[PDB]
Amino acid sequence: VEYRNWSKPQCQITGFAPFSKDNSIRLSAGGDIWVTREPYVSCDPGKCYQFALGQGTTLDNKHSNDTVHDRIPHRTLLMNELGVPFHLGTRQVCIAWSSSSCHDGKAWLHVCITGDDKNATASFIYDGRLVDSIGSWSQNILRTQESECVCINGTCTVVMTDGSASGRADTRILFIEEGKIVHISPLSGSAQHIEECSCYPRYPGVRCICRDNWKGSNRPVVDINMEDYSIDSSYVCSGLVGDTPRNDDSSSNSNCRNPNNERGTQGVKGWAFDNGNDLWMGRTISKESRSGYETFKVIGGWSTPNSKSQVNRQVIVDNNNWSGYSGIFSVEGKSCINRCFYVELIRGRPQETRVWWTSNSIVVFCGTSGTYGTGSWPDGANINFMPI
Amino acid sequence: VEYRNWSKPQCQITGFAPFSKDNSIRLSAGGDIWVTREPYVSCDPGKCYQFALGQGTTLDNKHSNDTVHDRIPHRTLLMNELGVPFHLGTRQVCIAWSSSSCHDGKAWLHVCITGDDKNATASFIYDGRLVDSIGSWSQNILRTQESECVCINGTCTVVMTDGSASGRADTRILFIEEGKIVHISPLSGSAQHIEECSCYPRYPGVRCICRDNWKGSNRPVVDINMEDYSIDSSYVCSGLVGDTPRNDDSSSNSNCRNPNNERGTQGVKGWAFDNGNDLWMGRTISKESRSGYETFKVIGGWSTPNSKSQVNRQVIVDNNNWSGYSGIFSVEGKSCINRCFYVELIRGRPQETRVWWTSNSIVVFCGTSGTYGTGSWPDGANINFMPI
Amino acid sequence: VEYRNWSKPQCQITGFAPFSKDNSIRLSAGGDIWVTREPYVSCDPGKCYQFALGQGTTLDNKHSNDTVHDRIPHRTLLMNELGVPFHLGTRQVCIAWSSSSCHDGKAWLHVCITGDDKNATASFIYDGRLVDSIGSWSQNILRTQESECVCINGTCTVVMTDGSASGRADTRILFIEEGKIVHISPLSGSAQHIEECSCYPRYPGVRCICRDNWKGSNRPVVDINMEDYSIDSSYVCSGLVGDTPRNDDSSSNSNCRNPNNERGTQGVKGWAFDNGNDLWMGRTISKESRSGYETFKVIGGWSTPNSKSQVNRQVIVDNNNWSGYSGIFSVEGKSCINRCFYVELIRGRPQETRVWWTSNSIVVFCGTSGTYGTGSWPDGANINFMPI
Amino acid sequence: VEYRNWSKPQCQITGFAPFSKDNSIRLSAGGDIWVTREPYVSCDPGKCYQFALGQGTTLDNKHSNDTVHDRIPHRTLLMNELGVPFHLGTRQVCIAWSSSSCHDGKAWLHVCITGDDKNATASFIYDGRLVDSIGSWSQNILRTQESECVCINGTCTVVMTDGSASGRADTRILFIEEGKIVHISPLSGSAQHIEECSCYPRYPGVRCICRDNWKGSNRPVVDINMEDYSIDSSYVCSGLVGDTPRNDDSSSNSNCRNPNNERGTQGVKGWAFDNGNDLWMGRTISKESRSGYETFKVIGGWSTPNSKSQVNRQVIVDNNNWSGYSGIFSVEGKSCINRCFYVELIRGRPQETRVWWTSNSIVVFCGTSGTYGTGSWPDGANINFMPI
Ligand SMILES: *[C@@H]1O[C@H](CO)[C@@H](O[C@@H]2O[C@H](CO)[C@@H](O[C@@H]3O[C@H](CO)[C@@H](O)[C@H](O[C@H]4O[C@H](CO)[C@@H](O)[C@H](O)[C@@H]4O)[C@@H]3O)[C@H](O)[C@H]2NC(C)=O)[C@H](O)[C@H]1NC(C)=O
Ligand SMILES: *[C@@H]1O[C@H](CO)[C@@H](O[C@@H]2O[C@H](CO)[C@@H](O[C@@H]3O[C@H](CO)[C@@H](O)[C@H](O[C@H]4O[C@H](CO)[C@@H](O)[C@H](O)[C@@H]4O)[C@@H]3O)[C@H](O)[C@H]2NC(C)=O)[C@H](O)[C@H]1NC(C)=O
Ligand SMILES: *[C@@H]1O[C@H](CO)[C@@H](O[C@@H]2O[C@H](CO)[C@@H](O[C@@H]3O[C@H](CO)[C@@H](O)[C@H](O[C@H]4O[C@H](CO)[C@@H](O)[C@H](O)[C@@H]4O)[C@@H]3O)[C@H](O)[C@H]2NC(C)=O)[C@H](O)[C@H]1NC(C)=O
Ligand SMILES: *[C@@H]1O[C@H](CO)[C@@H](O[C@@H]2O[C@H](CO)[C@@H](O[C@@H]3O[C@H](CO)[C@@H](O)[C@H](O[C@H]4O[C@H](CO)[C@@H](O)[C@H](O)[C@@H]4O)[C@@H]3O)[C@H](O)[C@H]2NC(C)=O)[C@H](O)[C@H]1NC(C)=O
Ligand SMILES: CCC(CC)O[C@@H]1C=C(C(=O)O)C[C@H](N)[C@H]1NC(C)=O
Ligand SMILES: CCC(CC)O[C@@H]1C=C(C(=O)O)C[C@H](N)[C@H]1NC(C)=O
Ligand SMILES: CCC(CC)O[C@@H]1C=C(C(=O)O)C[C@H](N)[C@H]1NC(C)=O
Ligand SMILES: CCC(CC)O[C@@H]1C=C(C(=O)O)C[C@H](N)[C@H]1NC(C)=O
Ligand SMILES: *[C@@H]1O[C@H](CO)[C@@H](O)[C@H](O)[C@H]1NC(C)=O
Ligand SMILES: *[C@@H]1O[C@H](CO)[C@@H](O)[C@H](O)[C@H]1NC(C)=O
Ligand SMILES: *[C@@H]1O[C@H](CO)[C@@H](O)[C@H](O)[C@H]1NC(C)=O
Ligand SMILES: *[C@@H]1O[C@H](CO)[C@@H](O)[C@H](O)[C@H]1NC(C)=O
Ligand SMILES: [Ca+2]
Ligand SMILES: [Ca+2]
Ligand SMILES: [Ca+2]
Ligand SMILES: [Ca+2]
User: Fold this and answer.
1) How far is the CA of A135 from the CAs of A197, A202, C90, C372, in angstroms?
2) Which of D42, B154, D83, D214 lies closest to A110 in space, CA to CA?
3) Alpha carbon of residue B349 to chain centroid
């Protein structure tokens, strides 16, 4: 087995085609299924896996009550083959209320964060053993991507933040070889707040589109040089911005450099990627709520400040249905690297108060150079049929 | 691993022997089991798998209600080893309300269709990744085989239809290499309506026996030339016709070339295969309903128009029990290629209205050159014992 | 991978040590577990598997009602790793109300019998495909070992019977190469009735200890010559006889040649094996009921007619607990072939009428050259705690 | 594959980082999960497994009642990948109410003890087959480690005791090659009572830290010479003693040689390991009950009698939560051998009498050379939510 280099061109895509759906919540009404949130997808060279953070309980279980909370000691990272729902034979890979995972061509790295808010621990598990750990550097919820990390030539990189969720924080980029931290670079450039990065290989480097939780409804960009560990950062140029909340399309702005100060506080994990001067991106359909999900290409979305000409829109989840986090993953093809994404479909509290739990299912799409139609692939559970 | 060529003679069979049964519905009354329909079987070079289209729910689950409907966004293709019932650890391979799968000797291809009736998307997934997609060409339920596709020397073929279910439609034959569509041929020949083809390798080509939903109770044939991509089509010669509905045996006809215009509208997926001038075929025992299942050889059934002399009949499911779809799969032996088939055993609505769901189990038989006796292997669930 | 020859001496044993227990019935009271009977064990070169005939239902399921019956179309052969209870992810290997399985060093052979009592079909499945089948030869419940067959140098042998259960029947010994029947030898010698053989390799041949259901409470022996397909048969010499029912030890007899005509009608599947002039054997503790289970060595039990000197007795299941069928399996060690056995622990009807089902768990012991103590390892379920 | 030698230096650790948690009890309230106790962890060269002794029943099951008892014939050793909770697909590896398991680099050895208190049997199962057995030598609960054994160059060693739990007993150290007992050494040295050893490779030998159930709240040490089979024993020097019960830190003593006669009777399985003159150890936080769990380094804890200066304390489970047994396992890294440990988190009787069962979950930590924070990772089940 050889290390991945991702040294192929990006697949030229026309949009996205359906790839996977797990129907977790519908199944939870007639089966023992894990309560989860913060899902993601990552693939080894042969096949894909779905990950999520468990809440230490199944849904039809009194312990599902009040699982809206983000951090308890019982949260563990779950890992199954993509499309295998989180049933009771699911492996809990590590203890984690925040995580990232990636395969370097030889083995899986898992970055697992747990413990006290003011003094958390990140464990680095590689090829089935604990190789390293780091403690909190700002004593304020050490946290990471909630999606796949990226490895080139046996060096994996992951973005982590510690500090305020509503003000300047301390973001660092780790470089990890076979589970061992070999270098840590501080964030540099013009991005002013970084959360929950969605990163992808862009050989010879790695590029991340993240969440600004402080002053931006435009999404920050972090560029990671894998050769010298140098970091740059900025914001997605597109005037059609990717965060939630955000302004209406007619009054939203980005200048590529600064947070836009437009409903900037709070946010949601999301993704985008560049193709030359253009941008492919997803976002919730609602400007204020985690409802619906759409993708489109923005002409000049990568290179032209405040560009708003979109094309090739697809509805993934219609706006009468709940969405959630979304993130990118990359899949090596015969001659190119494809970009895929997942959407977290959050059900229960706080939006749906008939039930006392909070959980999610997922839907997953992959880039295509072919053609496609239309649809909507929401969670699909009837809240009135659920155990409360 | 090398590509399959299927370049062995067809096994000379005397009939069929019992191979597998999953007891899905019986188990669903005391366990968490997927609601399914449109099952099939396909084998890699070592072992066989059962497939079906899930309805995004287990049976003992309020979401099972009104699963008689064919197309919802929560339908996914399920895949287990043959004989492993669809329990909660079952992998959902893709999103699909119509599908076909096949192994080319190196990896699995899945053809998965989902989305809006008037604008569906077919995804092509090979070796664990999305390689291609195509959109609806006639804006009227793009759809495919619901049984295995067939690959020779790395090229897989699958038959797809888009358009009216009760009139002239637009049928196309796709040729796919490692998940990439390399050629598309329109239907040609004398078949006037094609649905749900049951295809098999007949080196150097592929032969399909399908469903005419418009004017024929005789089954159409599609012949696929894998060298030059040319297509031919006709109808099975046998005067003992394979569709349901159909006329009784004394008043049924086929001329090998045209739909017979005998209770032609509607149909059921089924199969047959040639052996020289003769034909092995299955059909429902009832001429009007999806009840019972029988196989037999028709002497001159392939070559002689309106041939009605049968021999080697076997009852698979007696006529007091529900059947459903059936399809062929092929299994490479040491010196010959064997033909096998599955029968979908549909329980629930519309035939059984005590319950609100519709689901199925399967029974599976394989060609034998040996001897055998008699029996009947129906679904076996007591409708009165089931969750409603 | 090479064919097994079993060409090592038999391990010299001092008795038997505990090996496995599945606790099936206890688990069935809080879990979805298959209803079964007629279990057995067989091992490939690396590890062991438990087999049993399912009843097409779980225990906590209304379909478990009246599963005392031996033959229904829904019975399938289940196969798990030894000690994995028959949960809903269990693979149903074939359709069978009577079976035998064995691994030839390269792949699994399964012999699966199903269909009508007067016209059954035996399917021969090898390396995941149906290779052969045979129909009933006496039109009266074609049936086989309910324990492992035995293969030497790629030829597997299995004993089958068709005809009366209470009078002269037609017993045949099949020789099978990669699933294909290559020879069938009729029973020969002095054994007058043969059921449910427990066979083991005794290089260069195979030896079986079976059940006489007609005139003998002494167990018949069948010796199979794998070189020329010739058959011999006789009865176990031991005056301590192995069948149930049987006479008291003080009035039981065997002359090694004929059925003893001592409570000869009916019986139970069991086993024994030779070591020089001596015999290792198991039997129920009760003379009339399938209750308890004991093993011991009979001095001169193989060579001396009517020998009754036993030594090295062990209680496996005390006589306040239900037993059932038992059978031998053989396991290749570094320098010798070991003999192991399983005991079926039948619960429910007809003996326990609080519940309407009949099922079983298993316990498994292996020969040892070491030392051991005492115990009792019954099913362990409280009938009053069970779903009815 | 080659035999393990463990011939690398011990990793130099700063403390421990979170590795795994199974949430067994929380899940048992909404799923079918085994009742267990006496868990441990052991890894083959690629991955780690969790083990425990089942009670022949799931928790939500009337058979869970009165599972506080230590020895019934239905107890079996369960084995899953680490983090896969004990669901119904879990393999029962052998029959055992006391056990030890270890991988020698080529295959797994399991030591499984069951049967009558006064005449137990230990079975030795290697590479999937029973290779040896030994009977009770003192007729008083033959018993072993309840954690991993240790193998060097194909010879595995395990510590076993037979005799009084409250007085002089008969402890022996076994040496096992491919499942065959090749030598047995009696305990020698100054340890006066040995139970439940937690052993680890310390090339060229094996070192064990155990439980004195008679006169010591200081933990005994057993040193095993793998070259000549000689045995030495003593007590851990640390004045901060590891057993429960024990005196408070201001009045506890150890002289490295004798049991301290300080609340010596009874105990709990635990662990410690040397690093030069210092000692890493865990213990319950409570000095009288199995409540809480803490680790720390004792400066001079290995070499200096009655040393009480600690550093690098970590809370693993706070003292408001139940703990239980704990044990060490070792994991080979690239350049060093790491030490890890598990903590059994006992729920139910006798401490929690709302329910009638006794079961456990686990939490697992591994040595780290990096940094870490703080937390508490208790079982987490609400006793009021549980089936009784
Ligand atoms: C069948 O499916 C195909 C493929 O999905 C679909 O074609 C697509 O239609 C959409 C909508 O017209 C196209 O995307 C648009 O492109 C134009 C630029 O040409 C943009 O102006 C659009 O943006 C706006 O309008 C949106 C609502 O449609 C607003 O949400 C947005 O804020 C802008 O105002 C949009 O991006 C897309 O390019 C095609 N795709 C292709 C490959 O042609 C077709 O319409 C479907 N037909 C039916 C009957 O369902
Ligand atoms: C034990 O099992 C064997 C194998 O299954 C069985 O032998 C089979 O019997 C059937 C029925 O007789 C044979 O099939 C028939 O063949 C004749 C030609 O010889 C056909 O005319 C028959 O067709 C019609 O009759 C059917 C009703 O049986 C109608 O459904 C149909 O519309 C026609 O009118 C039919 O195909 C078959 O060939 C044999 N198979 C072999 C290998 O011999 C045997 O009968 C069973 N034993 C007992 C006692 O029943
Ligand atoms: C601890 O365990 C050991 C090993 O299991 C056990 O030793 C065994 O005891 C039995 C019973 O005494 C021995 O088997 C007997 O052997 C004599 C010949 O020496 C036979 O006569 C016995 O047969 C009869 O008695 C039986 C009842 O015991 C009747 O059922 C039977 O019909 C005959 O009348 C019987 O076969 C066995 O040989 C030893 N095994 C060894 C290896 O020594 C020991 O007794 C146990 N001790 C305790 C206190 O539990
Ligand atoms: C964030 O997490 C870090 C790492 O866990 C943590 O640092 C650790 O703090 C503990 C507690 O101070 C240190 O352990 C102590 O070391 C001193 C020697 O310097 C010992 O005297 C202590 O022993 C006693 O005190 C204990 C109570 O704390 C008693 O239980 C005990 O009986 C003794 O009386 C104890 O071992 C540990 O060394 C550091 N670890 C490192 C690597 O620095 C830090 O405190 C956390 N941050 C915050 C704000 O709490
Ligand atoms: C801790 C601040 C962080 C980014 C604002 O909040 C996240 C937001 C979440 C959210 O907005 O839904 C849920 C995440 N599980 C949470 N992360 C953690 C580690 O608790
Ligand atoms: C759309 C026409 C097509 C063939 C007549 O209908 C099928 C018939 C079915 C049927 O006759 O039972 C069920 C199939 N699930 C359905 N296929 C789709 C894709 O919905
Ligand atoms: C059919 C006669 C045969 C031997 C007497 O009866 C067996 C006895 C049984 C028994 O005595 O318990 C159960 C077996 N499942 C049955 N075998 C079959 C094939 O039905
Ligand atoms: C028999 C003495 C022994 C060590 C003191 O008791 C153990 C203590 C236990 C305990 O203190 O919790 C539980 C163990 N399951 C038990 N071991 C056996 C084999 O029954
Ligand atoms: C969930 O917990 C809350 C707070 O204790 C309680 O009011 C509510 O009844 C619980 N819900 C259920 C369904 O038990
Ligand atoms: C299924 O849905 C129908 C329509 O809403 C309803 O009348 C019926 O009661 C439902 N069935 C069950 C079992 O709840
Ligand atoms: C089992 O079936 C019998 C016969 O119909 C019936 O009398 C009995 O009530 C059934 N048992 C249960 C538990 O439903
Ligand atoms: C457990 O057993 C005891 C003793 O028989 C009994 O009193 C108690 O009710 C049982 N518990 C349950 C939950 O049935
Ligand atoms: Ca924001
Ligand atoms: Ca028709
Ligand atoms: Ca008899
Ligand atoms: Ca003590």
Assistant:
1) 20, 30, 44, 52
2) D83
3) 21
Element (H, E) at B25: helix B24-28
How far apart CA C171 and CA C243 sit, in angstroms, is 19
Contact A346, A360 (CB under 8 A): yes
* Cβ-defined contact of C129 to B366 (cutoff 8 Å): yes
Report whether B212 belongs to an annotated binding site.
Answer: yes
CATH of domain C1-388: 2.120.10.10
For residue C182, count other CB atoms closer than 10 A to its CB. 12
Phi, psi of D27 (to 5 degrees): -70, -35
Q: Which long-range contacts (CB under 8 A, 24 or more apart) does A247-255 make?
A: A247/A217, A247/A287, A248/A287, A249/A308, A252/A217, A252/A218, A253/A218, A253/A306, A254/A218, A254/A305, A254/A306, A255/A305, A255/A306
HSE-CB of D42 using CA atoms within 13 angstroms: 29
Coil/strand/helix, residue C6: coil
The secondary element (H helix, E strand) that includes residue C25 is: helix C24-28
Nearest Cα to Cα of residue C289 among C246, C256, C334, C326: C246
Separation of alpha carbons C358 and C290, rounded Å: 14
- CA-nearest of C11, C14, C45 to C336 is C11
Cα separation, A101 vs B101, in Å, equals: 30
Instruction: Give the neighbor-by-neighbor strand order of the sheet with D231-235.
Output: D195-202, D205-211, D220-224, D231-235
Which class for D98: exposed (0-12), middle (13-18), buried (19 or more C-beta within 10 A)? buried
Q: Which helix (H) or strand (E) holds C364?
A: strand C358-368
* Rounded Cα gap, residues C258 and C96, in angstroms: 32
Resolution in A: 1.8
Which helix H or strand E contains A26, and what residues bound it? helix A24-28
B72 C-beta closer than 6 A to ligand 10: no
Among the partner-chain residues D61, D73, D136, the one whose CB lies closest to the CB of C380 is D73
Specify the amino acid at residue A89.
Answer: G
Cis amide linkage into residue A204, ω under 30° from 0: yes
The finding on whether A180 has its CB within 6 A of some atom of ligand 1 is no
H-state helical runs in B231-368: none
Whether residue A220 has a cis bond before it, omega within 30° of 0: no
* Structural determination approach: X-ray
Rounded Cα distance between B370 and C182, Å, is 12
The three-state secondary structure class of A329 is strand
- B104 is a catalytic site residue: no
Compute CA C75 distance to the chain's CA centroid, rounded to the nearest angstrom.
18
Phi (first) and psi of residue D82, to 5 degrees: -55, 125
CA distance D270 to B361: 52
Please name which of B50, C172, B130 lies closest in space to residue A331, comparing C-alpha atoms: B130
Distance of CA C25 to the CA centre of its chain: 20
The active-site residue out of B70, B223, B232, B318 is B70
SS (H, E, C) C228-277: CCCEEEEECCCCCCCCCCCCCCCCCCCCCCCCCCCCCCCCCCCCEEEECC
Query: Closest Cα to residue B359, out of B15, B16, B23, B4?
Result: B23
Q: B339, B365, B344: which is closest to C133 by C-alpha?
A: B365
The C-alpha atoms of residue D316 and residue D293 are separated, in whole angstroms, by: 5
Consult the annotation and say whether C196 binds a ligand.
yes
Q: Which of D57, D58, D51 is nearest to D112 (CA)?
A: D51
For the record, the structure tokens of D169 come out as 């007993």
Q: How many CA atoms lie within 13 A of D97 on its CB side?
A: 19
**Residues with Cβ within 6 A of ligand 5?**
A 38, 70-71, 97-98, 141, 143, 165, 195, 213
Phi first, then psi: what are they for D74, rounded to 5°? -90, -5
